[PDB]
Enzyme design. Structure first.
Site: not given
Ligand code: CL
Ligand code: CL
Lengths: 248, 4, 249, 4
Positions: A34-35, A93-94, A135
């Site tokens: 997601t953005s 993200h992660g 994350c």
């Protein structure tokens, strides 16, 4: 000449050093990621915050995994001899051990390895700071209402020495980002740096960040699974000296 | 609020 | 009677058993997981395929992690004494060791543990088949162009992990591919091979045909260079102790 | 084609 102490990193080189900000907001459709609305607020706040600390800031947006690796490799091959420190900020993200490029994952270990004491010699003995808003898994925190035998023949340091990872969240957990205010962690980090960089050692600044994130933020969601959740950042320090952003 |  | 052999699971109980199909298409917004277009094609094909094999099929759609665990727990506590086997099909997002509920991850080990030989006694010694269409990571396959033994013990025990089979859609560490129009490569191939061969080949040999079909007949098409022209090989993970035939007599 |  008088008594001397060296408990703190030398931060009076001609330059404070680079601050590399990797801001990943938009991801390739095929990844399904997601953005990350609100991350531009983070990126802008960091740029200003580290500018005021006299870092040479470079902002990079929406990098593929390949571009991330080549950027880190290239930066690690620069001559940092006149620089006191190195800072890298990752906004993406992660999951545990991983940061997302726009088209897929990058091992955090791969990124940081370029700056190892033996692989980036102009940063050996200098603090290498990795600040990570991403994350680290999918857990949610529900919260709770309140002489010596051997000197050796060559003095070496560990190649993993003098790194610091300032993680937005505990291992295994989601990290929270507000779409209009920015991430809890980065907004708190910038605020504490602004207030305390001229009078507190960096670990103590980061401890104030921990308290701020832990006490002042709580998620609001129409989804019961994601509602009323809490966050604690995690300082992972392999530094060998105190770090003050000021000198003299 | 959203997660990363 | 005359000479007998015991190399195959007994599949002539009064019932073949349950086929539980968990079909997760739409995910809670906050998870950020994308809708899985094409998965209804998979679910419908599976229902029909296993209906023809005389399984009692139950389809469940869009289950939360809590609902998945409750469903598996409840099914494991049913009396399976009159059933030959157990089949569970998982259609969802995933990563290595994990299947996605609509609101977050479920450990595959948590799901399968309910059916352990010591925890589901009416399935002890019976084949327990988990068919999994889900990613196992994010790698992409670029492909390449072409007197006696000392001890009998005082207790006949079997391992609690025995008689499981995991038919994974993709290799460990890799994405799995799903076509939004045709359904997933793996499930569509699986159903085709079951329809063609369930009355004549042992199950491992059917799954080997599935492996070949997926490996040779599918290749991704994408405008994105990163995801274009990629391949897939499914993975059979077998802890079965006998040959499995869907027919008998 | 999409990945799961
Ligand atoms: Cl933004
Ligand atoms: Cl569908």
């Amino acid at each position: 000449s008088g008594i001397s102490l060296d408990n703190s990193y030398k931060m009076d080189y001609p330059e404070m050093g680079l601050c590399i900000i990797i801001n990943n907001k938009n991801f390739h459709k095929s990844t399904g990621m997601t953005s990350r609305s609100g991350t531009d607020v983070d990126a802008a706040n960091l740029r200003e915050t580290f500018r005021n600390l006299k870092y040479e800031v470079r902002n990079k947006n929406d990098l593929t995994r390949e571009e991330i690796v080549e950027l880190m490799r290239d930066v690690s091959k620069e001559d940092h001899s006149k620089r006191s420190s190195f800072v890298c900020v990752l906004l993406s993200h992660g999951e545990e051990g991983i940061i997302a490029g726009t088209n897929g994952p990058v091992d955090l270990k791969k990124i940081t390895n370029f700056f190892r004491g033996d692989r980036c010699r102009s940063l050996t003995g200098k603090p290498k700071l990795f600040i990570i808003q991403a994350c680290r898994g999918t857990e949610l925190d529900c919260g709770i209402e309140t002489g010596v035998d051997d000197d050796m023949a060559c003095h070496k340091i560990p190649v993993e020495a003098d790194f610091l990872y300032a993680y937005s969240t505990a291992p295994g957990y989601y990290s929270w980002r507000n779409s209009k205010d920015g991430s809890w962690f980065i907004q708190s980090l910038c605020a504490m740096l602004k207030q305390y960089a001229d009078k507190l050692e960096f670990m103590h600044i980061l401890t104030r960040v921990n308290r701020k994130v832990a006490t002042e933020f709580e998620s609001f969601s129409f989804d019961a699974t994601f509602h009323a959740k809490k966050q604690i950042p995690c300082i992972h320090s392999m530094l060998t000296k105190e770090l003050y952003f000021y000198h003299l | 609020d959203e997660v990363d």
